[PDB]
Design a protein around this ligand. Structure first.
Ligand SMILES: CCCCCCCCCCCC(=O)OC[C@H](COP(=O)(O)OCC[N+](C)(C)C)OC(=O)CCCCCCCCCCC
Ligand SMILES: CCCCCCCCCCCC(=O)OC[C@H](COP(=O)(O)OCC[N+](C)(C)C)OC(=O)CCCCCCCCCCC
Ligand SMILES: CCCCCCCCCCCC(=O)OC[C@H](COP(=O)(O)OCC[N+](C)(C)C)OC(=O)CCCCCCCCCCC
Ligand SMILES: CCCCCCCCCCCC(=O)OC[C@H](COP(=O)(O)OCC[N+](C)(C)C)OC(=O)CCCCCCCCCCC
Ligand SMILES: CCCCCCCCCCCC(=O)OC[C@H](COP(=O)(O)OCC[N+](C)(C)C)OC(=O)CCCCCCCCCCC
Ligand SMILES: [Cl-]
Ligand SMILES: [Cl-]
Ligand SMILES: [Cl-]
Ligand SMILES: [Cl-]
Ligand SMILES: [Cl-]
Ligand code: NA
Ligand code: NA
Ligand code: NA
Ligand code: NA
Ligand code: NA
Ligand code: NA
Ligand code: NA
Lengths: 311, 311, 311, 311, 311
């Protein structure tokens, strides 16, 4: 079966549409997500047109084998070709209404610099390669683009599922390719992070600042170093599985700054002790007293700067 | 093969029934479970009807290819079509009785706020898309809905497997959809959590409260901080298998409260030491003495409040 | 293809046999195991009868497609239908002799209360659903039930592979099911646990008892608390691979009892210190001296009781 | 269908080309990567040649079944044959132009001695085995070799995707084999490692060097040993998953040298204490004072030597 | 298609040969490895014999369907039947030369007592079941057994890939089974373990021995216990990937011994302190002085004994 011939040197327009049934498994590290949806395709093949009176039927149903179907493919899928045809209907004029159910593991990059207060725009790209007898272009039938009300993506808030209606028509290996961009907009549910990660992490850091109200070097070393181990362990406890970025993330800056704070705390503790030993308790006292305000103020300030830089 | 034509403008009623053979693999983080089951389908197609006296047979058996079968689909499955036809029987009147064995990874959301004392209602949804020639509705044959007595789901207690007999009726892309809700009611076996997690975690926290019977700052710092590290490692030991919720869980609250208790214990230990150093041992003694009753009483009280709020 | 007709109202006996080629992947958590085996089936289909004088051949060989084969299914598998037909031989009488190679992830529950000194009985259940024209019953050909001498299951000792010869013939969804039970008896190789887990865990607990020979509160706090951390880390090191049971396990009890011992050790250390501080070193000495015999004796006794309760 | 016969004892030249659509999942431990790409093949089959005036068509399209296609295989793939034919076009002279979409998990070794500042050359090898009737050789059509501009490999910078134009002809099991080498050149995005791993690891080591400004053995033991634990935990936190190499890696040497520094630090702390106890504080002071310059200088120097040796 | 008939009561000899293309994924815990190879089969079928002159061809090519092919199977594969036929060629006398590309996940047990200085013999077993008309036996064509020069297995050294030429012919379920043993000899690349595991682990133990140069019980308790935690974490850091053996391994013994050393060190530290407290510093000094030589000597000696017992 060859493609439908043109009426007069025109390309075949294939009207597309993705309707989301289920969304699941957003893998941050892999930068992938899985989807269960309908794919609707509509085009005109005049060769299939008929008189409804003669046939005694208002619409004819076909098997995929029986008629010519455009080779529509997904660009960014990790999944194998997972598709089941639901219906093929030919209206009296020769308009074919194709419908299939599919599931795919889609590969779309994520921006982690605002993590865990980040939002994403996931993409599902559709392509079709132009054939020797006719060029093919994609179109969006907005009536056949949407998502079911049940559609959820664990740990995320689903904002929208739209399509950039104008395709990207370009040349590849001497043939025309027509590409559409379906966008799934989502925003991370950040609630969990504040009682489960930010607050316990801030408590461990604050414990280290009690060393500014002690003159016991043995107690201070234990304080600052034990909270440092506790901090590490706490992030081991998180089992952070955020991929490696060629850029700095909001979380990454904060964590780094916290290591620096743990370091400076050690220096203060060391200086205070050295001065007490060097029979200069006057300076040792001044530094310790200053650090009681310096450490919380600098931390709060640095965080304001960081928050500002990231958002 | 087209659907059976109506006697007089009536929809095709497809009688369904899911009989659970095996249930397994409840993934909390994925919010999925796997199932091994029978799917029974029955509808009337008068074109298949026969006079048994002529046939010399009371029931005729068919191959799926040979006759029209309604395209029943599962809404919420992650799984690829995994179905094997067991039997297709046509009664003399035209009633087709279809039976298949299937297995599926079902995606059903879970409520974690009462975790690990939570109960779930898992769903298996069946759909049928109405066709161009005839509209289709799903029905439940209660005699063909059940579970085998062996059916177990590790770490859970299986309460029931029932079906909401009335289907959903709605339009999708200009066609009528008939959905059925099969509900598998389960309740978490919480026993394990009390000796393996709750009690050892309460012991580590109690050890920290011995600092209210000591005046040794070095010993107290060691106590409170080491038990805090211990706590973290103990939860790292858990290797928590719980998804990130946009809400607070019972477990989540408890853990948070325990971090707060570790923090306040440090403050007391710090204050008691500072006052002893400031030559005010009368206040330092009063605080330490109060804390001996305050810490356990507030903890017990706060837990009563939480338990009340969650259950 | 319909089943063979009865001579006079008798059911079709399908003689079965599983011969294990390979066993592997016993997943404790999942309660599953994988198997590579032969499945032998035999029944009579007189429609296939032939005269070898005419046929020239003493036994005919067929393709699964060519003849009626009973729909034998595995009840408790996770796996998809993974089967390769090796031979289908028919003798002049019509007796079919079917052989296939299969692999399957079998789901059979495990009893963990005697872990890691536990023994298991794994099951492989065959079923055949009776058809409209003839009832089908399963049978065991003992000559075709066994395991190869190489057959191993890592971390377990394979005792036996036998079959309950009497099938569980019952009624389901108005038809007759004939169920056979195959039993793979195994016992856990517990050697590894004693030098790798039991002994280093007993050493860490013993180190904590050295606090009964010290009067230094700072040293005692360090001892008892650091060994508690060590213990946690050591079970984190084990990365325990056991499921959550609705019952108490031998290992589970031991671990719990060890946590309780760590707690009571802290109480003693606390009491001894408070008394010394309260200028009552006479009682503090008595307690510490008693604890030197109390803790080992109570531990040994409690373990005898537990061992007795579990075995 | 047999291969096209030679005009006069010449081998069949199959013009190849791989066009990368998507690259993903570079697994360092497995030394594998996944690819989604076009495979273009072209050969002249003179039996397929046609007169365009008689046919009334300038190019004929075929089904893979209809014509002889060379058996091109990938050498180094872990993946199963995942290929979908897009187009088969025969020009009037009989020159077939084949195009397929494939995805494969490619096994190519990696050099870890410069990790995490390493660059790789990934290989995709195409083979063809000469047949009994005609010998086959591979060629590169440079116009059909490339990658889309979107092509990304998470955590890596994609430099180039080129092919060694000259194939490697050799004999195997008495037949001629034509191999082509496609090279995907990538360099690791090392940014992440400096704030997330190198710097916090250097801070933990610096904290241990404060023991050179203290005379308190109890405080020093705490410092040096706790930071040693922190270092371990920090690398557990990294969950380094870099395979086991028969050679020393840059990272591996650094880590090793850090363990040695932690050991020497303990010796210094031990020596300093022993001398103070032996009433030789003059030597103890000299050593501690020396160590303040010795440790940082030796470390900086050793790192320059290492960097030089590795780069 | 029946098997070729015998000339005079002789079995059919099928000449086999495995040629390794790729080897990868040696899973120690699963005791499996993956392979990509060629399988060459050759047998004589006189029904396929021809006069070269009549057909005008020296060799005829076939489709697997067209001719009788022996059902050769792999015994110890976890993998599903992953095979692609490359070529089938019939020589004028009727000798069929079959060639296929396969990939399999092979299950072969491993000996871990000399780990990580262990060597393995991995097996690939080929079986053939004798048919009703003719008995089939396996043979090795040594010219068709080998491995490509590129063949590597990460973390191992590939010594040889040979085949025990005499098959194991035996009776199974009343038919004759002919089995061939293909052997892949490998030896572990142990370099990595000495700087990454053995040496940092020995350093942590040596740090604990500094307690024999200190009289400070608080410092010694910290030393011995902290290094014991460090040791655990260091093996948790290693996250050892070795299954559970019913026998003791070299690594296993070493680790155990190290735990015993950590325990004895605590005893010494406890004894030394008790004696100092009991105002017997003469004995306390003697023990500490002895331990300075006892611990290294006993350790070195015990290791010599162990090494000797294992190798
Ligand atoms: C106690 C700590 C509480 C922290 C959470 C408060 C922010 C909540 C919020 O509303 O955060 C939202 C913005 C993201 O802005 P957006 O991307 O434009 O979305 C805006 C749309 N909203 C408002 C509907 C969501 O994130 C931030 O400002 C990040 C602040 C993080 C501070 C933590 C620093 C502490 C040290 C570690
Ligand atoms: C020692 C600690 C023992 C704790 C377990 C006792 C509850 C057992 C029970 O019966 O728990 C059941 C209820 C759930 O109520 P439900 O969902 O309506 O089911 C009710 C039907 N039952 C009774 C048949 C199951 O959970 C709770 O009340 C949770 C109490 C948790 C207290 C732990 C707080 C300690 C700090 C951390
Ligand atoms: C030093 C510690 C050594 C412990 C192992 C000794 C038992 C060996 C044995 O023979 O254990 C077998 C029995 C299981 O009895 P069964 O199921 O009937 O099989 C019996 C058939 N046998 C004998 C051929 C295997 O397990 C036990 O008694 C468990 C004892 C565990 C004690 C550990 C407590 C220490 C605190 C933590
Ligand atoms: C503060 C620490 C900062 C360290 C990173 C600085 C190097 C950046 C760079 O440019 O690194 C690049 C070179 C790799 O050289 P190349 O393979 O030839 O590629 C060169 C092409 N460039 C320059 C475009 C990338 O790596 C190094 O020299 C490694 C230095 C690591 C030092 C860390 C030691 C500290 C102890 C642990
Ligand atoms: C500093 C520590 C260095 C340890 C490594 C030295 C052995 C190298 C070698 O050559 O080891 C080889 C033999 C294995 O003998 P094989 O199986 O017969 O192969 C022999 C063929 N070779 C020589 C070509 C490989 O392993 C051993 O003797 C193990 C010794 C381990 C000692 C570690 C004990 C320290 C406490 C923990
Ligand atoms: Cl696609
Ligand atoms: Cl479905
Ligand atoms: Cl089955
Ligand atoms: Cl391939
Ligand atoms: Cl096989
Ligand atoms: Na399509
Ligand atoms: Na169906
Ligand atoms: Na301490
Ligand atoms: Na069957
Ligand atoms: Na510690
Ligand atoms: Na090909
Ligand atoms: Na075969």
């Amino acid at each position: 079966v060859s493609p439908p011939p043109p009426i007069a040197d025109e390309p075949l327009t294939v009207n597309t549409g993705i309707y989301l049934i289920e969304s699941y498994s957003l893998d941050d590290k892999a930068e992938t997500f899985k989807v269960n949806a309908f794919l609707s395709l509509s085009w005109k093949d005049r060769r299939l047109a008929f008189d409804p009176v003669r046939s005694g039927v208002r619409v004819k149903t076909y098997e995929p084998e029986a008629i010519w179907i455009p080779e529509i493919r997904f660009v960014n899928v990790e999944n194998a070709r997972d598709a089941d045809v639901v219906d093929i209907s030919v209206s009296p004029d020769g308009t074919v209404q194709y419908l299939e159910r599919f599931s795919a593991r889609v590969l779309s990059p994520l921006d982690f610099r605002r993590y865990p207060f980040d939002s994403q725009t996931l993409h599902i790209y559709l392509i079709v390669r132009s054939v020797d007898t006719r060029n093919i272009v994609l179109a969006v039938d907005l009536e056949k683009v949407g998502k079911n009300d049940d559609v959820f993506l664990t740990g995320w808030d689903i904002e929208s599922f739209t399509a950039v209606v104008k395709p990207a028509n370009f040349a590849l290996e001497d043939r025309l390719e027509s590409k559409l961009d379906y966008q799934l907009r989502i925003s991370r549910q950040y609630f969990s992070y504040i009682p489960n990660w930010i607050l316990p992490m801030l408590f461990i850091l604050f414990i280290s600042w009690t060393a500014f109200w002690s003159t016991s070097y043995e107690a201070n070393v234990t304080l600052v170093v034990s909270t440092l181990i506790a901090h590490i362990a706490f992030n081991i406890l998180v089992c952070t599985n955020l991929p490696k970025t060629p850029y700095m993330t909001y979380t990454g800056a904060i964590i780094f700054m916290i290591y620096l704070f743990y370091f400076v705390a050690v220096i203060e503790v060391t200086v205070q002790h050295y001065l007490k030993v060097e029979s200069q308790p006057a300076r040792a006292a001044s530094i310790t007293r200053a650090s009681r305000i310096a450490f919380p103020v600098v931390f709060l300030l640095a965080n304001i700067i960081l928050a500002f830089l990231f958002f």
